[PDB]
C-alpha cells in the first residue's frame with residue numbers, strides 16, 4: 001500500500017531526447033519512427049490494491065498495461081512488438097524489462113522534482129522522456 005503514490009496521476013510528455021536512436025536500436029522501422037516520434041502522449045498511472053495500471057494515450061497509439069510487481073506479463077508495445085514484461089520497484093524507481101526475439105530493453109520511470117522521467121535503454125543507447133503533470 002502506498003507503494004507508488006508519487007507516480008499516480010495524469011502526466012503529459014514535455015521533452016524527448018535521443019528517442020529516434022533508441023527506436024532504431026529497438027528495431028522500429030522508418031515510418032513508425034517518424035510517426036511515433038511526433039506523439040506527445042498522456043500517461044495515466046493508477047493503483048488499485050496490488051495492481052498497477054499504466055495507460056498511454058496519443059495520436060499514434062493508445063496502450064494499456066496492468067500488472068503486479070515482479071510478476072511477468074504479455075505486453076503489445078506501441079510499435080507492435082509482442083514482449084514479455086516484468087516490472088519491479090528498485091529503490092523507488094519502476095524498472096520495466098521487455099524481452100522479445102532474444103532481445104531486451106529496459107524502461108525506468110522515476111519521480112524527479114515535479115516531473116516523471118522515463119529512461120529507455122537498449123544496449124548502449126539511452127533516451128530520456130520527461131513528463132509533467134497534466
Ligand SMILES: O=C(O)CCCn1nc(C(F)(F)F)c2c1CCCCC2
Nearest residue numbers: 023036037039041060078079118129
Ligand atoms: O513512455 C514513453 O514515453 C516511451 C516508451 C513507450 N513508447 N512510446 C512510444 C510512442 F512513441 F509511440 F509514444 C513508443 C514506445 C516504445 C518504444 C518504441 C517506439 C514507440
